């Protein structure tokens, strides 16, 4: 599991469940190409997006579909989604967790990179 | 104005208006002594808490009364208040802005310190 | 001034000065079209991006160039930039402040929308 | 495990390891009484603070010793610590996670309350 996503809801104080997440990788023509996707579980986590073999160095975008999450709860949202864009760099063994904390008009994201 | 407080609401995307703020300073007997207090304005800001003369070196606690704010909006919040504790003026006077962003089950705070 | 951007630095406790910001608007062909850009001032603020006349309804992306900011401080950051994507002026004109707080491996963003 | 604490470091992009955490419970005389304490593990988590039997309804303060954490890394910090104050309410089965994300001049905290 070299790439995991964890999402929390700051309004309800809970994991953000059933949040769609789309991962893209920047192609040679400078466009974003679909790479992996899924929905967060009951724990707010999304595991199994990719494998060590497929997840090569490159520029990636992890897009968290925050607007659809808030709409499913009936809460007015501001953002369309929360894109998290970064370079994956092989610097010894690494696992990347993209964590996000969501509110209707605000969010935070952190990368947790461990060996 | 050596100490300012600014509060935003992450649910409504607005300044957090009429938020009570109590400032304490740690006394020689290690207890918290009342220092200054006030309420945020229509802009979510609280100016004029203290003066350069009164704001001496010390350990301060800026307590943002988040529970009363959320209850006045009819939303039950998780926290009792948001205390922000720091040492001030240790290397001479500085201007401190304590900013906070609120949600019912979460908050963030940052300090902007200028010379 | 219907669109303002404010950026703070969470490591130094200061405004994030000279941060490049690029604003795009989604065109009819679903591509991102350049709309406005600028750099934050000594206060960490970017004013005068657009006018009430030019800032029509649409989907906008406010891309904060966090990587160049951290690299100019000699700190390698995790993200390429911090894109903030939202629909604007859907229920008539509003004043939007996009605020962001930066750390090398994390950032937070909030929107303050006023009428 | 009815009360857990999880702490992340936004500068290094890692779990915040070996962070001291002190939990207090408000006594009848309105003072804070020590209740439980520990240090976050290699995963940034602190498990086993209390038991279902001891963790009754009441007002609690979870104080994260952020200044000692940053000092151990040699990074200049602003806050003395990050106190998180809340009422524990029995409203069916509940587990409380106090999560925090730390930067030298800023932090965020969220409560994740699950059944
Ligand atoms: Na994976
Ligand atoms: Na003042
Ligand atoms: Na403008
Ligand atoms: Na426990």
Numbering used by the authors:
A (entry chain A), B (entry chain B), C (entry chain B), D (entry chain A): 10 to 124
Q: What wording appears in the published article?
A:
Here we identify two segments of TTR that drive protein aggregation by self-association and formation of steric zipper spines of amyloid fibrils.
We chose the substitution to proline because it is known to inhibit fibril formation. None of the proline variants fully halted TTR aggregation, but substitutions S85P, E92P, and V94P and the S85P/E92P double substitution significantly decreased protein aggregation and altered aggregate morphology. In the isolated segment 91AEVVFT96, proline replacements in positions 92 and 94 completely prevented fibrillization. We speculate that the S85P substitution, near strand F, constrains this flexibility to prevent aggregation. Substitutions in strand F, E92P and V94P, most likely hinder self-recognition and further aggregation. The side chain organization explains why the residue replacements E92P and V94P hinder TTR aggregation because the proline substitution would decrease the shape complementarity between sheets in the steric zipper structure.
